[PDB]
Amino acid sequence: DAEFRHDSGYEVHHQKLVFFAEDVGSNK
């Protein structure tokens, strides 16, 4: 349960931070 939503939101987390640096960074 914990480790499940952990690794899942772990890489997905990197997904959100990468989406912000791609948009925000794109026009930063």
Is 6 annotated for ligand binding? yes
Is 15 annotated for ligand binding? no
Q: 27 phi and psi, to 5 degrees? A: -110, 50
Is 20 annotated for ligand binding? no
Token pair recorded at residue 11: 């890489």
Is 12 annotated for ligand binding? no
Calculate the alpha carbon distances from 9 to 19, 23, 28 in Å.
Answer: 14, 20, 26
Which residues are annotated binding-site positions for Cu(2+)? Answer: 6, 10, 13-14
Which residues are annotated binding-site positions? Answer: 6, 10, 13-14
Which residues are annotated binding-site positions for Zn(2+)? Answer: 6, 10, 13-14
